[PDB]
Design a protein around this ligand. Structure first.
Ligand code: HEC
Ligand code: HEM
Ligand code: HEM
Lengths: 62, 241, 106, 43, 131, 78, 379, 64
């Protein structure tokens, strides 16, 4: 036997609220970045070439 | 009390929740405003800030904004000795002040296009169907020359010269300048000047929607766990009787 | 002169009681009462049995409400069993207060 | 002041540091999002 | 029926829906009439209870059918194809499904009432003679 | 002035409850939910059904009639 | 006690109205509107203070100012649209709140219902003044027509309308006044809300069943704090769904046109939260009759406690009233529709019947239905 | 160029043909009895609507 993923997670990080919050702080960081990255990409996909990011070429450095 | 015709939900790249603005459209449209429209209608809250919003570079728009200050420049604003250079200057007022503006168009007062899209009821659709809407006066109707007949104006008459006509201008790339093709581009640039923030906002909305689902689901689970005990409890009565 | 009307009136009454949530809930018409000052004193006058019963039925009720579940068809309150057990008590309380009010005229 | 200081108290302090230590980390994370240090972003 | 026939198309949904409500009410009174005739209710108040039942039900079916049909016409704006009635047809059964408080009868009523209505429209389009 | 020890008197009632960590937030949610949601809605719809129907009917009539008067006037007088 | 943080500070004890308080068990989702109502006041407040961090209150600028808040200022666009949309929420939420005490007999708490009523009409004034701040066509004309509606009073009216405006029209004078009152009403309101909660903490919250729950009482902290947080979750969802996907949708007015005092939108009308009142006002030919009737629409609320006829403070177990209750809400919906309608025959005749049906439902129908039901139960 | 073609097409559909008969009679009724207060505008208002619904959907795939 081994602990379910959650039980492992639990005993490492959520017994002590000090570790729990530490977690959350860490998590909030890591999360923000991937969300953005992923969320942004999704959004840009739906407007391909409609946004300046796509269009900068035309009048850039000759 | 005249029936007013209403705008189609014209097919727009952005009609959809996640759909965003098409800058190339913006770009094109911009020029339309600038060449076709700058002449009588102003855009006060629009600065020469297309840069990233319109894909014009900072050198590109600087230049673009320089010539507009060389010809229409701050001499119409009150900067006696001002010429090319500046970027904080807003689009050049067609006339010194509104009263003049009505005289040039004979009593009528060219509405600031800044917010037309969001101002007048009916959005870009109306704006597009107005410009693109011009038909023959109806049998038995009379029309003072200024009073051109337009199928979509409240009072069934507008003081508007040939808004846009084929081959009015020319775009850099080569986009076929059709009356309508140009209006598709003009409207879009207007949509943006009306709600520049909204185009950026729509992306946040997509993120918000994704965030909300994860959050909405998570909140319910927390509520159930917290409210689980109340549902679980058993109540019974046991008197000796 | 109420013969047909009385029966008709009785027929209307069963439907309202059956129709009412109280019948479904299992709390007798008397437990649905708006607890006000007179009801309050009548309540206090209830016997341990009568009284504790009201506490359980409201207990079971507010528990169902909380869970949005109805009691089984078999266990419901049937109109024919209208325990108007509060009525007796409630009457007097009012009776006594009407008197008091009246005695205060002059 | 003097009353608070004690030979006995140390276990609580040790325990506090971890919770306190964990708490300290959160602020850095919290501050960092607002601060947006390029170096912090680089990290 | 001639009144109901001049829809036109599907314009003014209320004007149509009132007529369909009228037809549903008529058929409800007929069915109630034979039902009372052949199933002696005993105690007449129960008889008017019965007729109130059927009349209201059929009237409801006609109402909801009519307005869903015209709304679909004024929304899809197709608006002439037979399927345009079919939703209402499918809708009608559900109405019937509601009063009977049964998923079964409501489910069947959806399908068959739908197909019948669709055939009716198809018939108006094709001038089928029935008689 | 105390709200918990002073609410009311309750005799002879036993209550049984279980801990959050021993149970599931939703037990047979799809099965339980469909019945209760469906059963409750029908009763609720009926009681509140009358208010909804009248509003929809009136709105349709008002829009049509107001539009109708505005729509034709030239044909009537000549 | 020693080291029981809560009762140690006296101040901290006062806060255990959130954590320890007796809370009914059974309890519809409807209740979450009280809390939500207060989230809305706090939201509006923070938003307002940031908007009023970059707004100006002059004829010339106002328009521009708002226009500048939505363009050059960083995240002022959402702050403003959050603001605007918020207030819609604030009202949507308020009318759920009133419906729940119209239905369940919460209004039995006379004291608490009269503070509510004060609350509702305070929030009404704030929303009336805040919409004019921008100084757009709709705003401009709406404050003229409403304020001037006050000039229906025979002896004073006329003088009084001119005092309120601080002149003969609505120029600067009036627009700065609204800015000041808008800013200070929500802070006065906050004390009333807390006075409201005060009274309501003396008798606890009613329930679906309409019966005392003292026999089944739950700690607010464990249960209700999650429910409230969850209700916020949804609440914010709607706010952001509105403010992020359809900014303008719920803000009927498209008038982003700087006010021109000769110009007029022939279609002049308050936002959705006021339509009911509007419609009820137009139904009367006479001006003064309308204003009284306007007042009564809203002020009619305090009379309901006296109007209550039944023995079951809970509508829950009463059919007929449930049926008229709903109608009145749908009548209310009908009246809101008339508000955005040309004031012509079709709508006139409808509105008039609606206006009588509203007062009937409140003043005569329900009351009777209450009696009937009591007599059917043999009560 | 673009706009102008698609408009025509739109008025070539059986519902546009059908409702243009009201415009045709309108115009003549009004032009012949010129003194009348009859508005030909109001008649045109139906045609235009149906033309434009169509236009929109098609006209869009034609621009840039
Ligand atoms: C004469 C110079 C002129 C040009 C160039 C011009 N307009 Fe106008 N426009 C006017 C005048 C004058 C009016 C006032 C109409 C009235 O009062 O009947 C007007 C009115 C309008 C309206 C009517 C809105 C309303 O309901 O009041 C819109 C929309 C509009 N302009 C947008 C545009 C756009 C977009 C362009 C560029 C393609 C444009 N106009 C080009 C002169 C012009
Ligand atoms: C719950 C009470 C409040 C309500 C109902 C409310 C509502 C409104 C509304 C409806 C508008 C019009 C916005 C538009 O449509 O453009 C507005 C604007 C404004 N409000 Fe509030 N508000 C409230 C509280 C506050 C507070 C507390 C402040 C400041 C502390 C404030 C400051 C402002 C400012 C400065 C504006 C003008 C800028 C703009 O147009 O957004 N408001 N408010
Ligand atoms: C600024 C607006 C308001 C705020 C912030 C507010 C706040 C609250 C809160 C937090 C509660 C407790 C929870 C709940 O029952 O939902 C509550 C209850 C109550 N409020 Fe409101 N309130 C507001 C407006 C009103 C209005 C407009 C009325 C009626 C006219 C009113 C009357 C009541 C009543 C009667 C209750 C008690 C009902 C019961 O729980 O049995 N409130 N209020």
């Amino acid at each position: 036997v081994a602990p379910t993923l959650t039980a492992r997670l639990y005993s490492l990080l959520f017994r002590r609220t000090s570790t729990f919050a530490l977690t959350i702080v860490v998590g909030a960081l890591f999360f923000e970045r991937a969300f953005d990255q992923g969320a942004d990409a999704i959004y840009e996909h739906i407007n391909e070439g409609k946004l300046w990011k796509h269009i900068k070429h035309k009048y850039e450095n000759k | 009390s005249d029936l007013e015709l209403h705008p189609p939900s014209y097919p727009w790249s952005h009609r959809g929740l996640l759909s965003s603005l098409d800058h190339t459209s913006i770009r094109r449209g911009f020029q339309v405003y600038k060449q076709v429209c700058s002449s009588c209608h102003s855009m006060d809250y629009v600065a020469y800030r297309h840069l990233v919003g319109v894909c014009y570079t900072e050198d590109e728009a600087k230049a673009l904004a320089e010539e507009v200050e060389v010809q229409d420049g701050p001499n119409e604003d009150g900067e006696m000795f001002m010429r090319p250079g500046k970027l904080s200057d807003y689009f050049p007022k067609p006339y010194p002040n509104p009263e003049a503006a009505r005289a040039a168009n004979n009593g009528a007062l060219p509405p600031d296009l800044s917010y037309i899209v969001r101002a007048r009821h009916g959005g870009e659709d109306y704006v597009f169907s107005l410009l693109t809407g011009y038909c023959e006066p109806p049998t038995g109707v009379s029309l003072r020359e200024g009073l051109y007949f337009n199928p979509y104006f409240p009072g069934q008459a507008i003081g508007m010269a040939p808004p846009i006509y084929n081959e009015v201008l020319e775009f850099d790339d080569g986009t076929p300048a059709t009356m309508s093709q140009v209006a598709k581009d003009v409207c879009t640039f207007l949509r943006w000047a009306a709600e520049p923030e909204h185009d950026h906002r729509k992306r946040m909305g997509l993120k918000m929607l994704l965030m909300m689902g994860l959050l909405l689901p998570l909140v319910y689970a927390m509520k159930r766990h917290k409210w689980s005990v109340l549902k679980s409890r058993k109540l019974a009565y046991r008197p000796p009787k | 002169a109420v013969s047909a009307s009385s029966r008709w009136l009785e027929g209307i009454r069963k439907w309202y009681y059956n129709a009412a949530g109280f019948n479904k809930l299992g709390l007798m018409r008397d437990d649905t009462i708006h607890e006000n000052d007179d009801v309050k004193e009548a309540i206090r006058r209830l016997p341990e049995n009568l009284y504790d019963d009201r506490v359980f039925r409201i207990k079971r009720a507010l528990d169902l409400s909380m869970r949005q579940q109805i009691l089984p068809k078999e266990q419901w309150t049937k109109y024919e069993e209208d325990k108007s057990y509060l009525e007796p008590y409630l009457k007097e309380v009012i009776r006594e207060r009407k008197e008091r009010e009246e005695w205060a005229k002059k | 002041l003097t009353r608070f200081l004690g030979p006995r108290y140390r276990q609580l302090a040790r325990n506090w540091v971890p919770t306190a230590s964990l708490w300290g980390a959160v602020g850095a994370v919290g501050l960092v999002w607002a601060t947006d240090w390029r170096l912090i972003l680089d990290w | 029926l001639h009144k109901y026939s001049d829809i036109p198309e599907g314009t003014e949904c209320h004007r149509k829906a009132y007529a369909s409500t009228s037809i549903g009410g008529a058929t409800g009174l007929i069915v109630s009439a034979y039902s009372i005739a052949l199933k002696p209710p005993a105690s007449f108040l129960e008889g008017v209870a019965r007729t109130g039942r059927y009349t209201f039900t059929s009237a409801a079916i006609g109402a909801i059918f009519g307005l869903t049909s015209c709304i679909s016409a004024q929304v899809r704006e197709k608006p002439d194809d037979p399927l345009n009635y079919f939703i209402g047809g499918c809708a009608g059964g559900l109405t019937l499904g509601a009063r009977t408080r049964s998923y079964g009868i409501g489910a069947a009523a959806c399908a068959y009432m739908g197909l019948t209505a669709a055939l009716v429209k198809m018939g108006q389009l094709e001038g089928w003679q029935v008689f | 002035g105390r709200q918990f020890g002073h609410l009311t008197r309750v005799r002879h009632v036993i209550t049984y409850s279980l801990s959050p960590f021993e149970q599931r937030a939703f037990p047979h949610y799809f099965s339980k939910g469909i019945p209760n949601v469906l059963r409750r809605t029908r009763a609720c719809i009926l009681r509140v059904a009358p208010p909804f129907v009248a509003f929809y009917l009136v709105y349709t009539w008002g829009t049509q009639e107001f539009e109708k008067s505005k729509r034709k006037n030239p044909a009537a007088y000549e | 006690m020693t080291n029981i943080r809560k009762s140690h500070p006296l101040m901290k004890i006062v806060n255990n109205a959130f954590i320890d308080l007796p809370a009914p068990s059974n309890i519809s989702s409807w209740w979450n509107f009280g809390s939500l109502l207060g989230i809305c006041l706090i939201l509006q407040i923070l938003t307002g203070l940031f908007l009023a961090m970059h707004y100006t209150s002059d004829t010339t600028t106002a328009f521009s100012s708002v226009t500048h808040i939505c363009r050059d200022v960083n995240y002022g666009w959402i702050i403003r649209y959050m603001h605007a949309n918020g207030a819609s929420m604030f009202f949507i939420c308020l009318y759920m709140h009133v419906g729940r005490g119209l239905y369940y007999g919460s209004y039995t708490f006379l004291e608490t219902w009269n503070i509510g009523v004060i609350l509702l009409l305070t929030v009404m004034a704030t929303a009336f003044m805040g919409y004019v701040l921008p100084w757009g066509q709709m705003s401009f004309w709406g404050a003229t027509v409403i304020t001037n509606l006050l000039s229906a009073i025979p002896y004073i009216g006329t003088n009084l309308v001119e005092w309120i405006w601080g002149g003969f029209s609505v120029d600067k004078a009036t627009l700065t006044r609204f800015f000041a009152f808008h800013f200070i009403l929500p802070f006065i309101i906050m004390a009333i809300a807390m006075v409201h909660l005060l009274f309501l903490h003396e008798t606890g919250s009613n329930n679906p069943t309409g019966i005392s729950s003292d026999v089944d009482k739950i700690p607010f902290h464990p249960y209700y704090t999650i429910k409230d947080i969850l209700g916020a979750l949804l609440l914010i969802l709607a706010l952001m769904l509105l403010v992020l996907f359809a900014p303008d949708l719920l803000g009927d007015p498209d008038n982003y046109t700087p006010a021109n005092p000769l110009n007029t939108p022939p279609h002049i009308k308050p936002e959705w939260y006021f339509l009911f009142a509007y419609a009820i006002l137009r139904s009367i030919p006479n001006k003064l009759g309308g204003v009284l009737a306007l007042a009564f629409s809203i002020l009619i609320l305090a009379l309901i406690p006296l109007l209550h006829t039944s023995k079951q403070r809970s509508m829950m177990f009463r059919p007929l009233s449930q049926c008229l209750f709903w109608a009145l809400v749908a009548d209310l919906l009908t009246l809101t529709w008339i508000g955005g309608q040309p004031v012509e025959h079709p709508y006139i005749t409808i509105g008039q019947l609606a206006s009588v049906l509203y007062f009937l439902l409140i003043l005569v129908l329900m009351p009777t239905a209450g009696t009937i039901e009591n007599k059917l139960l043999k009560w | 160029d673009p706009l102008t073609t698609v408009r025509e097409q739109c008025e070539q559909l059986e519902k546009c043909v059908k409702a243009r008969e009201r415009l045709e009679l309108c115009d003549e009724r009004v032009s012949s009895r010129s003194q009348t207060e009859e508005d030909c505008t109001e008649e045109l208002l139906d045609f235009l609507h149906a033309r434009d619904h169509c236009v929109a959907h098609k006209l869009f795939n034609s621009l840039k």
